[PDB]
Amino acid sequence: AIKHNQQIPNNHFRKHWQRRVRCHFDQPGKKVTRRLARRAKAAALAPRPVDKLRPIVRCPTVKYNRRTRLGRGFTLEELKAAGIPRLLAPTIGIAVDHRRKNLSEESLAANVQRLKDYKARLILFPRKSNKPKKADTPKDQQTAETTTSLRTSFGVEQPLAPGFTEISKSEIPAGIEGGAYRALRKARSDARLVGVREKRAKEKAEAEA
Amino acid sequence: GALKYLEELSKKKQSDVVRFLLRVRCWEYRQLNVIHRASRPSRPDKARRLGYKAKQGYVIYRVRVRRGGRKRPVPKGATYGKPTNQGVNQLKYQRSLRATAEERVGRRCSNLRVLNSYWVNQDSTYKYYEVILVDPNHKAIRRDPRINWICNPVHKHRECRGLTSTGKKSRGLNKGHRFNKTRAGRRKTWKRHNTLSLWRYR
Amino acid sequence: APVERTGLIRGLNKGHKTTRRVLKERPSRRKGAQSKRTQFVRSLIREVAGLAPYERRVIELLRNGKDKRARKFSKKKLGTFGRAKRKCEELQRIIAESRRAH
Amino acid sequence: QEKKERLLREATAIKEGKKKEDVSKKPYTVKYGLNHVVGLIENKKASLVLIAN
RNA sequence: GUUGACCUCGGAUCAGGUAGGAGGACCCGCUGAACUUAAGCAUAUCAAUAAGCGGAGGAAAAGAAACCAACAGGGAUUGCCCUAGUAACGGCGAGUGAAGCGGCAACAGCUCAAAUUUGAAAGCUGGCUUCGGCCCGCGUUGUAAUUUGGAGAGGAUGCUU
RNA sequence: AAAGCUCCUUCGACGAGUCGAGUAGUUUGGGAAUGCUGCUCAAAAUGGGAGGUAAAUUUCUUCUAAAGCUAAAUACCGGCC
Ligand SMILES: [Mg+2]
Ligand SMILES: [Mg+2]
Ligand SMILES: [Mg+2]
Ligand SMILES: [Mg+2]
Ligand SMILES: [Mg+2]
Ligand SMILES: [Mg+2]
Ligand SMILES: [Mg+2]
Ligand SMILES: [Mg+2]
Ligand SMILES: [Mg+2]
Ligand SMILES: [Mg+2]
Ligand SMILES: [Mg+2]
Ligand SMILES: [Mg+2]
Ligand SMILES: [Mg+2]
Ligand SMILES: [Mg+2]
Ligand SMILES: [Mg+2]
Ligand SMILES: [Mg+2]
Ligand SMILES: [Mg+2]
Ligand SMILES: [Mg+2]
Ligand SMILES: [Mg+2]
Ligand SMILES: [Mg+2]
Ligand SMILES: [Mg+2]
Ligand SMILES: [Mg+2]
Ligand SMILES: [Mg+2]
Ligand SMILES: [Mg+2]
Ligand SMILES: [Mg+2]
Ligand SMILES: [Mg+2]
Ligand SMILES: [Mg+2]
Ligand SMILES: [Mg+2]
Ligand SMILES: [Mg+2]
Ligand SMILES: [Mg+2]
Ligand SMILES: [Mg+2]
């Protein structure tokens, strides 16, 4: 029953909503529980970092196309280029994704470098102390300052391109011959008429023959 | 080996060789009980494809159902309701006939676990199935790690909880934009969309 | 390097300039290929099993008869136009092999 | 039971200094098993087949 | 004829085992209303809810793509914030109503059917045993090793584990 | 004995009364029909499914169904504290 100048209401409160209400009075209590779980997990993994290595990935939509972020794992081609066995990768903190492909060469080159320098920073303790092996650390540089986050130390350096660039005058390029605005209109109408133009040209060839 | 040819032969269910062999078997059945033990599977290739093995602890049972459509059970035809839901005759059951066949077998053999079932024969008023069962208390079963996962107390009577292959079909357990309302459980998501959540700092 | 992108959006070949590369073909894409082990089996079973009643009606009507009717009938049984075209083509092969052999 | 004697015979030779296949010879036996037999005839290795009825 | 096997179907207070009932706040399914709202009322709404029935756990269920997308491409499942009271449905009336992208919590991957060990069923339940093994049985209508699409098999090749 | 890596002429087995289609009832925001179930018909090998408007012809993108297992983040004061 409207009586005055009102906004037409739409309140979805005709079911038995009172039976399903989820108040959050345990917001601080839950936070304490997670912090107790993190430090308990970090204690179990005494010298190891808590997290795992991730690759650099670009967002999939025309909006968000500009920004980059972390992915799930390295493709099987990325691991091969850096000379890491497939089975050994998951057991030294590296995350592997077997259902991703490298269509371009920019993404392939960026991830290989990001993975190659990690291999140089790795300290690998031997399986048995009394008998070390060829690939083990020779015990001289086992004592050094280490990192544990691996998400802040290996995060995205810069997600977006630089805001602007400064270049000297007389280096500014010349635009398209027609102009920027008219270059768009011509390119739009060319795709609209791709079908009409194509059949008219083709039927002319058969008409003359 | 030979099991590959059986796969190809069983595909052609209209050929003269197969059609004769199905007609005679269906008469051999329908003279025995509704539910009875089977000495060995009648479709060795199909049973093998579903996990059946030829070692102790594996048994096969078979059963038939009435092959119709559900009629609403009410006194005479009265329903005492609005006209939108007073139909009695053309209603349909929401689970396959394959599921009902598995469920009756489970009550008969209350100490075994159902693995799978498959179609064997059908008639004007019957459809026949064969059900694979596994003994969870046998020593030869608990020894093998490929199957001993079934001995855990969480796989009890998964026939009527909708956990076998036909149970997953009757539910919308598939990925994609088509199975939206039932991807993770129809009733679970309805709770999620209809709950009103309030935080401390609104 | 299949195709070169123009470098401006809203065009016939719009996109952002990049160096596309060719990649090795994954084994998951070999689903439909024929194998000599499965062609041998499928040929033998056809000899043993024979034909089906609905094929026997088309195969007779396909020779010395109409061709539009052979596709109206095939569609009504199989249910779709795409499968009907392939089935009619396949049955046309067996008659060619049968009579022309001997 | 016959297999046990041959297996024990091999153990004495391998400890003595003679390697395997020096005291035993190639066997000639009849084949059996449905999947095993089907493969044999597809390679044209079989010479005669008997089938139960 | 005598005798010895095979297949199917039975007896026993035979040797050794296993199921029912309770509980059901939360969880997986089936079955299924009307009061009420529309200022009447029948499609609609209350509601894919209450009652009725079957089956589990300390969590259950879901889950390693026959997915989302149309991009410079994302990459198992679950939950929170946002998308959004939006696209769409509706005597287009009263009313109803999701998903992809995006930030975070938490992260972990795998074995079967389809191949001949064929130069050796290499595998297993049970009984007895001095503890070393033996005997019957299950099984060739297929029990171990080998392979699961990310591959793999078959060949090459030198180091490593 | 068993296991990992780099290269190659050639081979490379992949789930059926199922997928799909017509019709009926129910259901969904799903609209020439989103899912489910009964009945009739019933497939294929570069095949098959999907690409949110029914149909024919010609291209393109992306996955590999009809067998199975598995911790954590989530729900709950019914039971013992
Ligand atoms: Mg038996
Ligand atoms: Mg009925
Ligand atoms: Mg009523
Ligand atoms: Mg109705
Ligand atoms: Mg109504
Ligand atoms: Mg599934
Ligand atoms: Mg406010
Ligand atoms: Mg007794
Ligand atoms: Mg008893
Ligand atoms: Mg009970
Ligand atoms: Mg009320
Ligand atoms: Mg009223
Ligand atoms: Mg009133
Ligand atoms: Mg009234
Ligand atoms: Mg409704
Ligand atoms: Mg209830
Ligand atoms: Mg928990
Ligand atoms: Mg579980
Ligand atoms: Mg897979
Ligand atoms: Mg993709
Ligand atoms: Mg995901
Ligand atoms: Mg409707
Ligand atoms: Mg509703
Ligand atoms: Mg997200
Ligand atoms: Mg023993
Ligand atoms: Mg291997
Ligand atoms: Mg498959
Ligand atoms: Mg169907
Ligand atoms: Mg109903
Ligand atoms: Mg419908
Ligand atoms: Mg499961």
3-state secondary structure chain A: CCCCCCCCCCCCCCCCHHHCEEECCCHHHHHHHHHHHHHHHHHHCCCCCCCCECCEEECCCCCCCCCEEECCCECHHHHHHCCCCCCCHHHHCECECCCCCCCECHHHHHHHHHHHHHHHCCCCCCCCCCCCCCCCCCCCCCCCCCCCCCCCCCCCCCCCCCCCCCCCCCCCCCCCCCCHHHHHHHHHHHHHCHHHHHHHHHHHHHHHC
C-alpha to C-alpha distances, C70 to A106, B181, C76, C89, C98, nearest whole angstrom:
56, 43, 10, 11, 19
At which residue do the structure tokens 């039927």 appear? A203
Separation of alpha carbons B85 and A148, rounded Å = 64
What end-to-end distance do the CA atoms of chain C give, in Å? 52
Distance CA B178, CA C53 (A): 37
What is the rounded end-to-end Cα distance, in angstroms, of chain B?
Answer: 69
Nearest alpha-carbon partner for C52 in C84, C85, C77: C77
Report how far residue B136's alpha carbon sits from residue B147's, in angstroms, rounded to the nearest whole number: 9
Method of determination used here: cryo-EM
Whole-angstrom distance, CA of residue D46 vs CA of residue B126: 45
DSSP D1-51: -HHHHHHHHHHHHHHHT--TTSS----------HHHHHHHHHTT--S----
Best C13, C19, C29 member to test A by mutation, with max A CBs in 10 Å, is C19
Distances (CA, A) of B83 to B13, B79, B80: 44, 9, 9
Cβ–Cβ below 8 Å for B3 and D35: yes
A98 touches strand F (CB under 7 A): no
Report the distance separating Cα A41 and Cα A46, nearest Å.
Answer: 9
Q: Give the strand pairing for B35-38 and B58-65.
A: antiparallel
Rounded to an integer, what distance in angstroms lies between the CA atom of residue C23 and that of residue A75? Answer: 13
- Single-letter amino acid, residue D40: L
Which one, of C52, A182, A31, lies nearest residue B12 by Cα? C52
Contact C10 A101 (CB under 8 A): no
Query: Angle at Cα A164 formed by Cα A159 and Cα A165, nearest 5°?
Result: 120
| H helix intervals, chain B | 2-11, 16-28, 44-49, 97-108, 139-142, 165-170, 186-193
Ligand with minimal distance to C31 CA = 27
User: Tell me, what amino acid is at B14?
Assistant: Q
Q: Which two tokens stand for residue B63?
A: 């059963």
Nearest alpha-carbon partner for A52 in A36, A38, A70, A39: A70
* CA–CA separation, B144 and B139 (whole Å): 9
What is the Cα–Cα distance from C69 to C62, expressed in whole angstroms?
9
Q: Is the CB of B137 under 7 A from strand E?
A: yes
Tell me if A186 sits within 8 A of A180, measured CB to CB: no
* Protein CA at D14 to nucleotide C1' at F3, angstroms: 26
CA distance B150 to B114: 10
Cα(C62)–Cα(C95) distance, integer angstroms: 9
Task: Give the SS3 label for residue B112.
Answer: coil
Do residues B35 and B62 make contact, with C-beta atoms less than 8 angstroms apart?
A: yes
Q: B12: nearest CA in chain C?
A: C49
Q: What SS3 class is residue B168? A: helix
Relative to beta strand A56-58, strand A68-70 is antiparallel
Q: Which of A77, A106, A184 sits opposite C10 (nearest CB)?
A: A184
Nearest chain A residue to C9 by CA distance is A184
Chain B residue with Cα closest to A16: B194
Residue with tokens 């005494």: A46
Binary contact (A21, B200; C-beta < 8 A): no
Per the structure block, which two tokens stand in for C68?
A: 């539009």
- For residues B160 and B166, the answer to whether their CB atoms sit within 8 Å is no
3-class secondary-structure state, position B130: strand
